[PDB]
Design a protein around this ligand. Structure first.
Ligand SMILES: O=C(O)CCCC[C@@H]1SC[C@@H]2NC(=O)N[C@@H]21
Ligand code: NI
Length: 129
């Protein structure tokens, strides 16, 4: 099913997901995403560093803008020994969204690697749900 036939201004700022988490991101001119993430759930307290990338020249045919970012869940307060990656697309307009699927991998022994990774889906909006 996979194949092949500003974003910057739209992405930069604060976003909120359906769990009550807060994303604070700056999109750089050459594809960088940098900022912080605060999770409303899980083994998390305060803000965590986030870094990622986005397509800085997306298609102009009504398609979304591909992007992704990572948070390692270690900061000055807690270390969950886990990291999450969100993969998705930014959809602009009056009801802008970042629609993502997210993998959360915990450090495990080899015996437990089969249960290392969660998959979920987060939808981000510019106003709090
Ligand atoms: O408990 C952990 O291992 C660290 C916190 C994980 C929180 C996850 S990341 C995917 C989902 N979306 C969120 O905003 N919070 C949870
Ligand atoms: Ni956890």
């Amino acid at each position: 099913h996979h194949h092949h036939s500003t974003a910057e201004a739209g992405i930069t700022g604060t976003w909120y997901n359906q769990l009550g988490s807060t994303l604070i991101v700056t999109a750089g001119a050459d594809g960088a995403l940098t900022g912080t993430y605060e999770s409303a759930v899980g083994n998390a307290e305060g803000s965590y560093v986030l870094t990622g990338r986005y397509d800085s020249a997306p298609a102009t045919d009504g398609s979304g803008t591909a992007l992704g970012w990572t948070v390692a869940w270690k900061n000055n307060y807690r270390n969950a020994h886990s990291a999450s990656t969100w993969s998705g697309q930014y959809v602009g307009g009056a009801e802008a969204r970042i629609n993502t699927q997210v993998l959360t991998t915990s450090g495990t022994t080899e015996a437990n690697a089969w249960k290392s990774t969660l998959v979920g889906h987060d939808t981000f909006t510019k106003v709090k749900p």
